[PDB]
Amino acid sequence: MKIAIINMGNNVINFKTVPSSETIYLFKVISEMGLNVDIISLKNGVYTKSFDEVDVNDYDRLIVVNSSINFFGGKPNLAILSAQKFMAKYKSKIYYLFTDIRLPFSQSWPNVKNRPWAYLYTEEELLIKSPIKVISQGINLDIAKAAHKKVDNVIEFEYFPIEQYKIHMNDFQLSKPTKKTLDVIYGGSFRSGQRESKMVEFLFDTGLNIEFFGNAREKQFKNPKYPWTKAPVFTGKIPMNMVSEKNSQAIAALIIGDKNYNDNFITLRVWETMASDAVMLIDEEFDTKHRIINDARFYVNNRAELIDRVNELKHSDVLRKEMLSIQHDILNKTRAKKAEWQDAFKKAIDL
């Protein structure tokens, strides 16, 4: 049982970028599942085998991590064309991992077909005809299914909490009590504007000491419908394997989702915060049924409620330690089901 795993639009090498870290993380959790896995990427590396040194049909399973089909500057994107050429030539079913609601499986030939350098490829070489199995990180397959309106070869949809890989990795540990230097923290990118209201709502004009580390830049927050005067401190991106440690320098850390993730997806970020020394403060809208933790102190409705909750946390160390303790405990109850998650994942990839 040889499994192949690939990022459909991103080069994989180390943990300096999120799309490469997510792929490497997955390869690990699968390998620790007792499975035999190889990551296939642009060039050979510490975790990767090169696409043109491997014949995709040697694997009994091709798992593909989501990606856009965006050709920056309109110019060829080797990550995309190499991966699609790779997938197009596999004869069996493809397990597409849907971790981001913004990256449905999509066919590149349509794009390419119309670019000026089209002649450099052929339909035969890039059109994926194999049947696809979408594995949804979100519990709502109508949102998953809706997202893949335009693609026809996608005959199967299944739910699987893919992002729990982080809490299931064998090297996992909860963050230790760290010296506080921030009130509230949040890491990520701008999401192409997909979450501007929530980010401004909760991180701008709060009066608190807040940082937003990631690929998000202040200049991107320019939508008139969502005005602000005081933006948080935007630092740069840090490796995916440092996140909890970063998160841990803040009293609290923020959970906000895209409108479609609400009561739908549980995101990687949720575990990254729950395993950290920063108290988890979730937007009430993101999980209205409090499935993440059943205590209303972990949920906030607006900027004002968030500011109030941090004030209480800054005031009562007892309440702060108590809540981290609760979230840490609650995190482990899920980790206690590591086996059932391994089994479910296997079943999901037809094993």
Ligand SMILES: O=c1ccn([C@@H]2O[C@H](COP(=O)(O)OP(=O)(O)O)[C@@H](O)[C@H]2O)c(=O)[nH]1
């Ligand atoms: O400097 C940073 C900021 C974010 N992340 C990763 O990016 C993820 C969040 O990605 P996104 O902005 O798409 O947010 P989401 O939609 O997942 O909440 C986090 O969970 C981290 O794993 C990271 O590795 N380094």
